[PDB]
Amino acid sequence: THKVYVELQELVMDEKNQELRWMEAARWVQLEENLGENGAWGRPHLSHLTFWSLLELRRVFTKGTVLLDLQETSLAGVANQLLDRFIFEDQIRPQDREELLRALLLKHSHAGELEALGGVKPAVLTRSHSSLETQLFCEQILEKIPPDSEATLVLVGRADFLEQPVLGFVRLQEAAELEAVELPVPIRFLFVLLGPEAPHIDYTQLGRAAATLMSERVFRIDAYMAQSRGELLHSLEGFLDCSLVLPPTDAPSEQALLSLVPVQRELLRRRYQPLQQTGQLFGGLVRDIRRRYPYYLSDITDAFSPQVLAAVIFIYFAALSPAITFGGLLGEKTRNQMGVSELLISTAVQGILFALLGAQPLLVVGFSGPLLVFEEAFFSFCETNGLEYIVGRVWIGFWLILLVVLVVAFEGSFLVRFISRYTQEIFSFLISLIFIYETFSKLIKIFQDHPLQKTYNYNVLMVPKPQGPLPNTALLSLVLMAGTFFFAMMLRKFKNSSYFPGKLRRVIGDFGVPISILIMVLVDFFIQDTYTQKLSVPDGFKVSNSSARGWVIHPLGLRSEFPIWMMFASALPALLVFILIFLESQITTLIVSKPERKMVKGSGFHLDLLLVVGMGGVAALFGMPWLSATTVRSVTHANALTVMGKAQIQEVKEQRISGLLVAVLVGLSILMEPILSRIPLAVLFGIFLYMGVTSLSGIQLFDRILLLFKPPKYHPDVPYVKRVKTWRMHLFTGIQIICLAVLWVVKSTPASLALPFVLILTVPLRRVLLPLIFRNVELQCLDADD
Amino acid sequence: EGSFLVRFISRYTQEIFSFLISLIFIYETFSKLIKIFQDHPLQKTYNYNVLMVPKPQGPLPNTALLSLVLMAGTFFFAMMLRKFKNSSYFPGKLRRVIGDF
Numbered sequence: 001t002h003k004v005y006v007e008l009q010e011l012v013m014d015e016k017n018q019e020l021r022w023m024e025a026a027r028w029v030q031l032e033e034n035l036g037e038n039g040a041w042g043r044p045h046l047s048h049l050t051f052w053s054l055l056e057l058r059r060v061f062t063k064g065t066v067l068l069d070l071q072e073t074s075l076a077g078v079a080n081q082l083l084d085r086f087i088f089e090d091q092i093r094p095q096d097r098e099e100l101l102r103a104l105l106l107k108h109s110h111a112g113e114l115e116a117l118g119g120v121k122p123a124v125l126t127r128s129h130s131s132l133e134t135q136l137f138c139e140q141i142l143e144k145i146p147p148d149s150e151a152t153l154v155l156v157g158r159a160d161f162l163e164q165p166v167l168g169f170v171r172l173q174e175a176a177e178l179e180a181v182e183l184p185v186p187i188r189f190l191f192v193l194l195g196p197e198a199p200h201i202d203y204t205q206l207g208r209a210a211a212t213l214m215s216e217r218v219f220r221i222d223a224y225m226a227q228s229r230g231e232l233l234h235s236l237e238g239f240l241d242c243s244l245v246l247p248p249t250d251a252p253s254e255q256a257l258l259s260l261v262p263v264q265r266e267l268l269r270r271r272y273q274p275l276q277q278t279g280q281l282f283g284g285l286v287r288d289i290r291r292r293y294p295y296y297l298s299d300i301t302d303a304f305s306p307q308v309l310a311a312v313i314f315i316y317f318a319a320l321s322p323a324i325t326f327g328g329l330l331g332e333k334t335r336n337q338m339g340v341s342e343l344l345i346s347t348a349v350q351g352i353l354f355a356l357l358g359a360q361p362l363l364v365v366g367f368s369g370p371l372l373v374f375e376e377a378f379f380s381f382c383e384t385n386g387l388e389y390i391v392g393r394v395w396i397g398f399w400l401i402l403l404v405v406l407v408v409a410f411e412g413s414f415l416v417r418f419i420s421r422y423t424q425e426i427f428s429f430l431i432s433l434i435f436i437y438e439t440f441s442k443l444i445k446i447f448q449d450h451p452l453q454k455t456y457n458y459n460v461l462m463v464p465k466p467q468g469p470l471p472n473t474a475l476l477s478l479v480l481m482a483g484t485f486f487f488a489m490m491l492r493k494f495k496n497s498s499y500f501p502g503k504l505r506r507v508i509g510d511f512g513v514p515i516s517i518l519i520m521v522l523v524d525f526f527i528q529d530t531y532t533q534k535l536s537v538p539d540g541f542k543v544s545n546s547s548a549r550g551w552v553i554h555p556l557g558l559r560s561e562f563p564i565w566m567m568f569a570s571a572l573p574a575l576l577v578f579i580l581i582f583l584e585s586q587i588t589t590l591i592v593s594k595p596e597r598k599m600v601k602g603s604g605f606h607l608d609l610l611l612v613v614g615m616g617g618v619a620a621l622f623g624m625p626w627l628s629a630t631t632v633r634s635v636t637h638a639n640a641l642t643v644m645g646k647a648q649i650q651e652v653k654e655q656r657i658s659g660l661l662v663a664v665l666v667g668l669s670i671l672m673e674p675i676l677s678r679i680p681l682a683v684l685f686g687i688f689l690y691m692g693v694t695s696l697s698g699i700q701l702f703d704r705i706l707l708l709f710k711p712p713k714y715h716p717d718v719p720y721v722k723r724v725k726t727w728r729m730h731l732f733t734g735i736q737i738i739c740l741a742v743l744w745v746v747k748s749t750p751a752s753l754a755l756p757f758v759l760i761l762t763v764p765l766r767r768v769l770l771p772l773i774f775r776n777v778e779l780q781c782l783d784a785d786d
Numbered sequence: 787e788g789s790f791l792v793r794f795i796s797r798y799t800q801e802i803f804s805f806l807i808s809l810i811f812i813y814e815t816f817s818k819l820i821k822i823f824q825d826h827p828l829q830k831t832y833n834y835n836v837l838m839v840p841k842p843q844g845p846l847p848n849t850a851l852l853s854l855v856l857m858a859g860t861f862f863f864a865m866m867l868r869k870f871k872n873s874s875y876f877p878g879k880l881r882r883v884i885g886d887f
C-alpha cells in the first residue's frame with residue numbers, strides 16, 4: 001500500500017501559439033485543489049461529484065481497457081501499448097491510432113508555465129462555460145506528499161473523430177518517473193478518458209470522478225492488488241454503494257450538510273474494517289418403504305398419459321432384444337441348460353414383481369454382459385471339476401439371499417454415499433461407450449457374414465441361418481439401421497421444434513422411437529427378395545434342454561449328487577455375483593435419481609437391492625438367470641418418461657405401470673411370435689445407437705471431454721468453468737479419461753470380472769490422490785452431487 | 787436497353803422461379819437414384835455372368851444399395867461439415883477452413 005497523489009490534466013490550447021497541450025486542471029493530495037484562470041490554485045475542498053460523472057465513469061469502466069503490471073518506464077510506451085489494446089478491444093479504429101498518440105505525446109504544461117503562455121483555453125481534438133469548482137473555489141505540495149508515495153495521472157480529452165467515449169486504465173509494474181510529465185512522485189496509475197461530444201458527458205467531471213475514485217483508500221488498494229477488470233469493476237460498485245447523494249433541498253445548507261455525518265459514518269463502517277445409516281436393524285428397508293409406498297396411488301394415476309405408452313413400446317424392444325441375444329449366448333455357452341426361454345420368463349417375473357413392489361420402479365431389470373461372463377466362467381469351472389452347473393447356480397443363489405438379507409439388515413447400502421459423481425459418471429460413460437461399441441460390432445459382424453462380393457451362390461441353405469454370403473443383406477441392414485437412427489433423432493428434434501400444433505408435436509415426438517421402428521419395419525416388410533435377420537423367440541414356454549433339466553432343480557443333484565464341499569464353496573462365486581449386482585444396481589440408482597433429473601418421489605436403495613438379489617437367488621432354484629438393474633435400459637426408461645419444459649427438465653412421470661407392462665410384454669413375447677418375426681435386427685441396432693447417444697446427456701464427463709475440443713472462450717457458464725482454470729479442468733478430465741482407458745482395457749481382458757474392483761479403486765483416488773493436486777474449491781466445483 | 791424490363795420482375799416472380807427450379811433439381815436428383823434402383827433391383831438370385839461394357843446388361847447385386855449409402859453419406863458429411871463451420875469447436879481458423887472445404 002502507498003499514499004497517492006492524483007493529477008488531472010486536460011487537452012487545451014494556448015492563446016500565444018495555438019498549440020495543443022495537456023494542462024494541469026486539478027490535483028489530489030488529501031483534498032481536491034483546482035487550478036483556475038490566472039494560475040492560482042484554489043481552496044482545498046472535498047471532492048464532490050456529479051451524478052452524470054459517476055454514471056459515465058461506471059459506463060466506460062464496464063467496457064474499460066485495462067492494462068496491469070505494464071513493464072514500461074516512459075509515457076511513449078504506455079501510450080503505444082494502450083493505443084494498441086484499444087485497437088485489440090475494438091474501442092477505437094486503427095486509423096485514429098496515430099492522431100491519438102500524436103495527442104498523448106504532446107507537451108504537458110503545469111501551473112508555473114500558465115502565465116508565460118498568455119492564457120489557456122479549452123480545446124477539442126480534430127483528426128487532421130467555466131467549471132463549477134473554478135466558479136466556487138478559484139475566483140478568490142512536496143511537504144504534504146508523504147515520502148513513500150506514488151502518483152496517478154488522469155488524462156482527459158475530447159476527440160470528435162472517436163465514435164464512443166473510451167476509458168483506459170494502466171497500472172505500471174514499477175513506479176516510473178516519467179520525463180514527458182514531471183511530478184514530485186513517480187507515476188503508477190494512468191487514467192485515459194477520451195471521446196467525442198456526448199450528452200450528459202462533461203469530461204472534466206469524468207476526470208474528477210476518476211481522480212476521486214483513485215484517491216479513495218479502498219479502491220486504491222483494490223487497484224493495487226487487481227488482476228483483472230472485473231475486480232476493478234467490483235471495487236467501483238462498492239465505491240458507488242457508499243456514495244451518498246444529496247438532492248436539491250431548501251434546508252439551511254450548514255445543517256443540511258451536517259446531517260450527513262452519521263449517514264456517512266454508518267455507510268463507511270464496514271468499508272474500512274436416503275443414504276443415512278440409522279443403526280436400527282433393517283432401518284434402511286423400513287425407511288425405504290416409508291418413503292416410497294405412500295406414493296403408490298400416484299404411481300398408477302401418473303401413468304395415464306401417451307408418453308407412458310410410448311415408453312412401454314420403447315423399453316419393450318430395449319429389454320427384449322438384449323434378452324433374446326443373451327439367451328442365445330447363455331445357451332450356446334451352457335449347452336442350452338440356460339437359454340432364451342428361461343431368461344425371458346425370469347425377466348418377466350422379476351420385472352413384474354419389481355414394478356409392483358420396488359421403491360425405484362423406473363429401473364429396468366435384466367441380464368447383462370458381466371453376468372454372461374460369470375456364467376461362462378462358472379460353466380467352465382463346473383466342466384473342469386465334473387460339477388453340475390445348474391445345481392451350482394442353485395447353491396450360489398442360496399448364498400446371495402443370505403448376503404442381501406445380512407447387508408440389508410446392517411444397512412450395508414449406506415456405503416453407496418461414498419460413490420461420488422466421479423465414479424458414477426466414469427461408470428455411466430464406460431457403459432454407454434461399451435453399448436455403442438457392441439451395437440456397431442453387431443453391424444460389422446453382419447457385414448462380415450455377408451460381404452460385398454462380385455458373385456454369390458444363389459442356391460444356399462436358409463435354415464436355421466444362411467449357410468453363406470447373401471447379396472444385398474449387409475447393405476440393407478446398414479440402410480435400415482441408419483434410417484432408424486435418423487428417423488428417431490429427427491422426431492426427437494421435432495419434439496422440441498416450433499412446428500405443428502404443440503399437442504400433436506409433443507404426442508408425435510413422444511412416439512418417436514415407435515414411429516421410427518414402424519416405418520423401418522414397413523420398409524423392410526415391402527422388400528421381399530432381400531434377406532434380413534429378424535427376431536427369433538422360442539416355440540413355447542419350455543426349457544431350452546428337456547434332456548438336461550426340468551423347471552425345478554434338486555439342490556442335491558439331478559443326474560448325480562452335488563458334493564458337500566461345493567455347497568460351502570459357492571459363497572465365493574456368490575460373493576462375486578453379489579458385488580456385481582450391488583455395484584451395477586446401486587450406481588444405476590444413483591444415476592437415475594440425481595437431483596438434476598427432477599425425481600421428486602424418492603428412491604430406495606436397500607429395498608431395491610433386497611428385491612433384485614433375492615429374486616435372483618430364488619430364480620436360481622428354477623434354473624433361471626439372476627438379474628441386475630441395467631444402466632442403459634434404466635437411463636433410457638428415465639429419459640423416455642422425462643418431461644421437458646419451456647432445455648430444462650420439468651418433471652418425470654414416476655409410475656409403476658410402464659415397467660410392469662414392459663415385463664408383461666417380455667413374458668408374452670413367446671406368444672406374439674408372428675409380429676416379432678417381421679422386425680429386423682438392424683432397426684433395433686439403430687434404436688440401440690439412439691439409446692447410447694441419448695444416454696450421454698446428463699454426464700458432466702462427456703461435456704468436459706467436449707470442452708477439450710472447444711476454444712477456452714465458448715466454455716459454458718458453469719461453476720467448474722468460471723471457478724477453475726482451464727488447464728486444471730482439462731487435467732481433471734484427462735485423469736478421468738485415463739481411468740476410462742484402464743477400465744476399458746480391463747473389460748477386453750479375460751479378467752473382466754475384476755471390473756467392479758477397478759471401478760471401486762476410483763473412490764480412493766478421488767478422496768486421497770485428487771486433493772494432492774487439486775484444491776478443495778476446485779474439487780467441489782468439479783465433483784458436485786448437485 | 788431491353789434489359790430494363792427486368793425491373794418489373796419483383797421478389798414474387800424471382801422466388802417462384804427459384805423455388806420451382808430448386809424443387810425440380812431435387813426431384814431429378816432423387817429420380818436418378820430411383821432409376822439406379824430400377825436398373826439393379828433387389829433380387830433373390832442374380833446371373834453372375836453379366837457383360838459390363840459399355841454399361842451392365844442386367845441387374846447386379848449390392849449396386850443400388852451401395853449407391854444409396856454413398857449418396858446418404860455424402861449428404862450427411864457435407865451437412866455436418868456445414869454445421870461444424872458455424873459450430874463452437876476447434877481453433878476458429880481451422881473450423882472455418884475445414885468448413886469451407
Ligand SMILES: CCCCCCCC(=O)OC[C@H](COP(=O)(O)O[C@@H]1[C@H](O)[C@H](O)[C@@H](OP(=O)(O)O)[C@H](OP(=O)(O)O)[C@H]1O)OC(=O)CCCCCCC
Nearest residue numbers: 495496497498499500501502503504505506507508645646
Ligand atoms: C391435427 C393438428 C392440426 C390439425 C388442424 C390444423 C390447424 C390447427 O390445429 O391450428 C392450430 C395452430 C394455430 O392455433 P393456436 O395458435 O391457437 O395453437 C398454438 C399451438 O398449439 C402452439 O403449439 C401452442 O404453444 P405450445 O407449443 O404448446 O407452447 C399455443 O398455446 P400456448 O403457447 O398458449 O401454450 C397454441 O395456441 O396452427 C398451427 O400450429 C399450424 C400448424 C398446422 C398444421 C397441421 C398439422 C397436421
Ligand SMILES: CCCCCCCC(=O)OC[C@H](COP(=O)(O)O[C@@H]1[C@H](O)[C@H](O)[C@@H](OP(=O)(O)O)[C@H](OP(=O)(O)O)[C@H]1O)OC(=O)CCCCCCC
Nearest residue numbers: 707708709710711712713874875876877878879880881882
Ligand atoms: C487438431 C487441431 C490442432 C490444435 C491443437 C490444440 C492446440 C490449440 O491450438 O489449442 C489452443 C487454441 C485456443 O487458443 P485461443 O482460445 O486463444 O484461440 C481462440 C480460438 O481460436 C477461437 O476459435 C477464436 O474465435 P473464433 O471461434 O475463431 O471466432 C479466437 O479468436 P478471437 O475471438 O480472439 O478473434 C481465438 O482467440 O485452440 C482452441 O481453440 C482450443 C481447442 C483445442 C482443440 C483442438 C483439437 C485437438
Ligand SMILES: *[C@@H]1O[C@H](CO)[C@@H](O[C@@H]2O[C@H](CO)[C@@H](O)[C@H](O)[C@H]2NC(C)=O)[C@H](O)[C@H]1NC(C)=O
Nearest residue numbers: 331332333334335336337544545546547548549
Ligand atoms: C442337452 O444336454 C445334453 C446333455 O447335457 C447334450 O448332449 C451332449 O451333447 C454334447 C455335444 O455333442 C456332447 O457332450 C454329447 O453329445 C452329449 N453329452 C451327454 C452327456 O449327453 C445336448 O447337446 C444338449 N442339447 C443342446 C441343444 O445343446
Ligand SMILES: CC(C)CCC[C@@H](C)[C@H]1CC[C@H]2[C@@H]3CC=C4C[C@@H](O)CC[C@]4(C)[C@H]3CC[C@]12C
Nearest residue numbers: 395396397398399400402556563564567568570
Ligand atoms: C448359506 C446357504 C447356502 C445354506 C448353508 C449351507 C450349509 C450350511 C448347509 C445347509 C443345508 C445343509 C445340507 C442339508 C442336507 C444334507 C443331506 C444329508 O444327508 C447330508 C448333509 C446335507 C448335505 C447338509 C450339508 C450342510 C448344508 C448344505
